[PDB]
């Protein structure tokens, strides 16, 4: 692997209810790879949330987090759809290419801050 | 709900051919490496073929190069090893398996190939 | 080709008792180290990915370990559904290549 995948923005915002796109980069020339997002534990536990492609050995996915590759095939949107103020943390993506050899890397990480919703001023 | 179902094996002459094919359901066939495993008796479990998602990337042990061909036919969601030139060697069961992001965790049933004058 | 050779051949145990079986690559492998069971006339069916991942849905008793070119299985207390031909793979580089197996057979 030539190079680990980026993850940006580095800091993402959004309110609460509104959807969280990260894109996360990694040159291909379509040879066999696994793209992984996780989220940081609060215990430093890295865990994944969505797989391109999806993991046929998972017990299921969560629908609120999805991968779509864009055109391009090197960028893929990472969305957080309805986002929720517990989904504020720590989060990353990572790669599997197999040749010529294994190799495992993950992305720099980034904040998501998702924000309590304003109520009608009074 | 996640399947592979191989068809073709068979006997088969020493110098003669034999096409496999595998059929999958219950995920998204294209997105994923399609491979075949044989296991011969007395032998460790061989590699032998794997083809990308796209059909574009073919790999292959150098003891079936030049013999083996994977292919796939992504909108019948089948993937298929022709066989040539065959040997005493390679009777084996013949396994379709899916492998992701380098272990196997999709495998079909193991179609026997006999190869015997 | 990465050569694995695994040990023993055979391991003779009661049900209740741990098994230990293991596996060492010809070269460094890092973690890229899977492990599988296999029943006379099936497939082989995956327990453990990356040396030490525990696959979802495999019993608590299984567990692998190592890094580099020397790994382990681990079956804490085996129960009856557990004798069985055991396999290592590695996919470090290619060709991938498999052990030749542990047999997990009764003591009695």
């Known amino acids: 692997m030539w190079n680990p995948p980026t993850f940006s923005p580095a800091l993402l915002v959004v309110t609460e209810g509104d959807n969280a796109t990260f894109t996360c980069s990694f040159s291909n020339t379509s040879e066999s790879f696994v793209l992984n997002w996780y989220r940081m534990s609060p215990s430093n536990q890295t865990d994944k949330l969505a797989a391109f492609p999806e993991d046929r050995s998972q017990p299921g996915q969560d629908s609120r987090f999805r991968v779509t590759q864009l055109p391009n095939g090197r960028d893929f949107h990472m969305s957080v759809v309805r986002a929720r103020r517990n989904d504020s943390g720590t989060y990353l993506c990572g790669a599997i290419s197999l040749a010529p050899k294994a190799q495992i890397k993950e992305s720099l990480r980034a904040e998501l801050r998702v924000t309590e919703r304003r109520a009608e001023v009074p | 709900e996640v399947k592979l179902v191989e068809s073709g094996g068979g006997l088969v002459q020493p110098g003669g051919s034999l096409r496999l094919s595998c059929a999958a359901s219950?995920?998204?066939?294209?997105?994923?490496?399609m491979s075949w495993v044989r296991q011969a008796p007395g032998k460790r479990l061989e590699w032998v073929a794997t083809?990308?998602?796209?059909?574009?990337?073919?790999y292959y042990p150098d003891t079936v190069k030049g013999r083996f061909t994977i292919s796939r036919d992504n909108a019948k969601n089948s993937h298929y090893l022709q066989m040539n030139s065959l040997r005493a060697e390679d009777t084996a069961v013949y396994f379709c398996?899916?492998?992701?992001?380098?272990?196997?965790?999709?495998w079909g049933q193991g179609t026997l190939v006999t190869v015997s004058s | 080709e990465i050569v694995l050779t695994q040990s023993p051949a055979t391991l003779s145990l009661s049900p209740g008792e741990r098994a230990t079986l293991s596996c060492r690559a010809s070269?460094?492998?890092?973690?890229?180290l899977h492990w599988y069971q296999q029943k006379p006339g099936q497939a082989p069916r995956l327990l453990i990915k990356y040396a030490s991942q525990s696959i979802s849905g495999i019993p608590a008793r299984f567990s692998g370990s190592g890094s580099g070119t020397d790994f382990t299985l681990t079956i804490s207390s085996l129960e009856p559904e557990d004798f069985a031909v055991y396999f290592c793979?590695?996919?470090?580089?290619?060709?991938?290549?498999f052990g030749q197996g542990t047999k997990v057979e009764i003591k009695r």
């Open positions: 793979q590695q996919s470090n580089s290619w060709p991938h290549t």
């Open positions: 398996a899916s492998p992701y992001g380098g272990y196997f965790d999709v």
């Open positions: 219950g995920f998204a066939f294209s997105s994923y490496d």
């Open positions: 083809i990308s998602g796209g059909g574009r990337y073919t």
């Open positions: 070269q460094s492998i890092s973690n890229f």
